[PDB]
Write a protein that binds this DNA or RNA. Structure first.
Ligand SMILES: Nc1ncnc2c1ncn2[C@@H]1O[C@H](CSCC[C@H](N)C(=O)O)[C@@H](O)[C@H]1O
Length: 327
DNA sequence: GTCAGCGCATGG
DNA sequence: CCATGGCTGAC
């Protein structure tokens, strides 16, 4: 993560829905806001959260009466993406994992917060011939909010990962906010090779396979794109090998392949997958964040999360717009 | 609960 | 043509 000296959000409160690791929390707290409620039902997510923040998130959102919730100013929520991802069955709202959005709607109507800030995958904006996005747009307008959405590739903001996501911000109609804007991009100056650990700590992650085919030569100069050097088996998800001089591919939570959830990389002549910590780093997490003791669960948790750095820049821009109230 | 081989939509 | 991003069955 980046460091914010001008704390544009001091004195405001928010809630953490579908918390996971608490990615939304680090982002907002670094700016000066305060967390007053949280909610996440996965047994293990509940453990890491407690370990790093010191409180236990409430359970199942579908059975929590909306009137218990504390008063707040910003509702943070990165709802489930398996029903909308380009790697799935694309069942949208017909999937019981796809109807969460409406519980958000339910909560919003009662507490009328100043800002709603959500996140989801690139394909959300194109699913069902574009109908799905309209539905979120119209429901938000009807509840008296404005709607702002855009797709941002992580490599345009300092993190070497090809992760494209749609971000959605909604201000309450009576505040009259007319100058919010999405941060401007910049040149990358960090690559996969600048975050790896020493060879003595990753020795157990190596893999020697004899169905290894080489389709390209290792490059000699840095670039901001994924460079495939080889393949194993048939070359499907988790069977592709890239270079440490380019950038990482999207980390996932239920992935397959011999190089599951992270991908394979050629390091100093040997091929291997990434360490939980090297995963924490390509997601922009700080070396002080204690990860879960069970390696397996740790991989899944990272593949489900958000990048910290992008959430930060957008967070700042939000506060700036709320703070401009001239005579 | 963990592992690994898959199979096809979408965007050039 | 060419490359990327969860589901399902096995123990
Ligand atoms: N019905 C429900 N009630 C509560 N939490 C739920 C839920 N359905 C799914 N979840 C949890 O929703 C999360 C969505 S992914 C979000 C990750 C989070 N943004 C990050 O910063 O790490 C998963 O952890 C899932 O276990």
């Amino acid at each position: 993560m980046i460091e914010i000296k001008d704390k544009q959000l001091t004195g405001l409160r928010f809630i953490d829905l579908f918390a996971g690791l608490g990615g939304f929390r680090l982002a907002l707290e670094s700016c000066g806001a305060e967390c007053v409620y949280s909610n996440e039902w996965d047994k293990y997510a509940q453990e890491v959260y407690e370990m790093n923040f010191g409180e236990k998130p409430e359970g199942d959102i579908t059975q929590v009466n909306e009137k218990t919730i504390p008063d707040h100013d910003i509702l943070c929520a990165g709802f489930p993406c398996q029903a909308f991802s380009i790697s799935g069955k694309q069942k949208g709202f017909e999937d019981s994992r796809g109807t969460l959005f409406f519980d958000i709607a339910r909560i919003v109507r009662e507490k009328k917060p100043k800002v709603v800030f959500m996140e989801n995958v690139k394909n959300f904006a194109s699913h069902d011939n574009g109908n799905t996005l309209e539905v979120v747009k119209n429901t938000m307008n009807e509840l008296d909010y404005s709607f702002h959405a855009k797709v941002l590739n992580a490599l345009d903001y300092g993190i070497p990962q090809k992760r494209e996501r749609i971000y959605m911000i909604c201000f309450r109609n009576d505040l009259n906010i007319q100058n919010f804007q999405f941060p401007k991009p910049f040149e990358l100056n960090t690559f996969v090779k600048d975050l790896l650990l020493p060879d003595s700590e990753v020795e157990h992650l190596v893999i020697d396979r004899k169905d290894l085919v080489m389709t390209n030569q290792e490059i000699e100069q840095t670039t901001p794109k994924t460079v495939r050097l080889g393949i194993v088996g048939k070359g499907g998800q988790g069977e592709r090998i890239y270079s440490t001089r380019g950038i990482a591919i999207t980390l996932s939570a239920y992935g397959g392949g011999i190089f599951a959830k992270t991908g394979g990389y050629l390091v100093n002549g040997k091929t291997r997958k990434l360490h939980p910590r090297e995963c924490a780093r390509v997601m922009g997490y700080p070396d002080s964040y204690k990860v879960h003791p069970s390696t397996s669960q740790a991989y899944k948790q990272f593949g489900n999360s958000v990048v910290i750095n992008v959430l930060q820049y957008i967070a700042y821009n939000i506060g700036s717009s709320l703070n401009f109230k001239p005579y």
